[PDB]
């Protein structure tokens, strides 16, 4: 008679990803199927990559898709806090218990030490693992080194022989040798935990009963199962979902198909269609969230890797567009781009470049086209040969992919940094941005246009221009990455 | 006495730029002297009347008296003014200044033939001028169709005192015997405006140069009646940059064309004022620095490129809010967009595909590519023919709706040796700039009459246009089509 409770636990380290929505949909349907609750927990334990902006992008993207949770950082809940950065005291308590009970230990190995051990191991054809150095430390030495304030971590003990049985709800028993595990770090030197500890503690304290996650987390499942044993906690039911696949059997990557949810919103896809498509890849047709929930059952999940096919997603999205009143269609188009907020940002940039209103559409059309018409001749540069032009586009694209705050000045800073580093003037690079972003050699202010267009469409158009001109080889990619990392 | 000016547009078509030019000067002259400017309709369709009101008001022109705003010296529609016109024509016939004519249209058409064969300007030969009082009483009792004509001198010269040109001499032997009352009991535009100007207290008659040749007949009617003549001024013609007369073949003349193309009314009104007298200024400013003497004796030039530059300055020299409001009214409103919506909803797989598909609804013209007009069962000469004939019949279409637009295109086809399905391949590129697009017939109704004709004409002129031998030959086809 126990109420079901599932969760999605994304890290706010970048754009909201389609994979996250996919897993969130399954955990949502399973909880609603069983009359339970669906929780959202922000795993911002990586305070060097987590941002408050990325947190809100997660909320907006999922809510836009139609996914809603009963408890979370933005709605509250009786089992919070739901941000792992607000639960520091909790993780220390349970990490200390493990050490007290002998199931974990303090490690003082400096980064210079761990690197040396890994080298000596790779030279002995051995599997790289923590050598257990600090596991056999006297209590006298441990007390001393901690009193001096020496940096340290907490590692868990793991078996060296035998096998762990992972009882997947769909695969059955999955045997994983313990010797593939290592003495995983639980508490980092900065007093923050790893997901191994945070997810076990938090899934337990929040009463999570079923955990559907992607199969990428299955290899490390034994360490979580073992942590539950150490605490004497009841383990939740586990199901590891196959990966999303590109139609060519490869893994879903930003190169082949964009993975950002916001990309499909800005491209003009309906949230009902994208959500509907994620469900059709999952289990066993056009349906709403409510209808997908009533017909949901984990057994109907194809044991094969679901395929993300933009062709089928576009056909489905057209079916949704067609199978609704013109009023509904109109309201969706307004929310998408035909609204005063978007149009008034464009207004001041066309007002000075038209002699009558009929010239606005050819000038501002690129604000609504998604991509732009690709004309390779528009990138013939006077000072830059074709190879140098591809280098500039690749370096700019990389820096803009890493840019977290999509704002004109930060956008300009990335481009100007790529140019100054290459001993180029910003005036030498902007002529390439115009055709990439707008499709024309001259247009409105391109830096303003990129901020208005947003990060997703700007990167998409830059990548297409790069691919139009041939792209970059593996050799060039390696050589240009060295340059990327030396740029602010 | 208070100055009183007017315009008397006929509600028989779309309002042309020439009408707004004349209206502006009449409005400015009246305001300068603290008088009234009157709009009179000498009717013809009640819809065409509202077009005139809407187009002139959109420009910023107003009138103190008229059929819509009323006034103390109406009615302001001829059709509402009773049998006042037959009364004055009868006085002229009784006082011997007019006479009754029984000539048949077949006979008046023959005299015109003999006169044009001599390179003469056609005139009424004066047949019925001296018919017996008995012969006329008989035919009238029998109910024979007849009209009333005014008598004009045959020798001498009429001195027309123009406020700008000075004295203009015109020979009476050029004037003809103008019809006063038509065979249907309605007055001619000539008699009605003379009668109505007198009854409405019009003091200054500012007209286009096209009416100068008839000034003697106006002067003589006032003479016959014994009425005080109004001050007269005939404005020089609007001309293209090549010194020719303004023509829809060269530059479009409908006010509504420039509205649908995205010009600001303050800019077109300013351009009409900056052409005549003496640079950007408003209407209230135009009235401030207005004076008739600043008009040049030579015709003003309607230069579209100069108009575009001026419109661009009006767009720039205003707040972004004012600019956005103007763009909303021009085309970015729910009425226009919801007309397009159902025609793109079934043709897109995502919203980012809408703008490439629907862009032609906003581009004024479209990108021209001659290669798009290559037809299987049609040659480069026949394509121009259908385009011309389609254009002509659509230029004559009064009510611009899909069911009547399709009728015109079908009539040109049925009359031709081809089926309707044979012509649409040419319409799609001309109207949308693409080989295929949304329902082109629904698109033309949405785009409007002005932009549809403009694009068809641009397409026709792209492919080469029509020669003189082709036009006169193809018009005979146009007139044989419903
Ligand atoms: Zn250690
Ligand atoms: Zn006669």
Coordinates of C-alpha atoms in Angstrom, one line a residue, chain B residues 10 73 75 89 91 136 138 167 208 225 248 300 305 359 411 447 456:
Chain B
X10 CA -17.2 60.8 -59.6
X73 CA -25.6 73.7 -48.0
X75 CA -27.6 67.6 -50.2
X89 CA -31.8 73.5 -68.6
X91 CA -34.7 78.1 -68.7
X136 CA -40.0 69.9 -81.7
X138 CA -44.5 67.1 -81.9
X167 CA -5.2 85.5 -69.3
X208 CA -6.7 70.2 -63.0
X225 CA -27.8 82.5 -66.2
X248 CA -0.8 53.7 -64.5
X300 CA 5.3 68.9 -61.2
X305 CA 12.4 57.2 -56.1
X359 CA 6.6 36.2 -47.3
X411 CA -13.4 34.3 -69.0
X447 CA -3.3 40.8 -51.3
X456 CA 1.1 41.0 -62.9

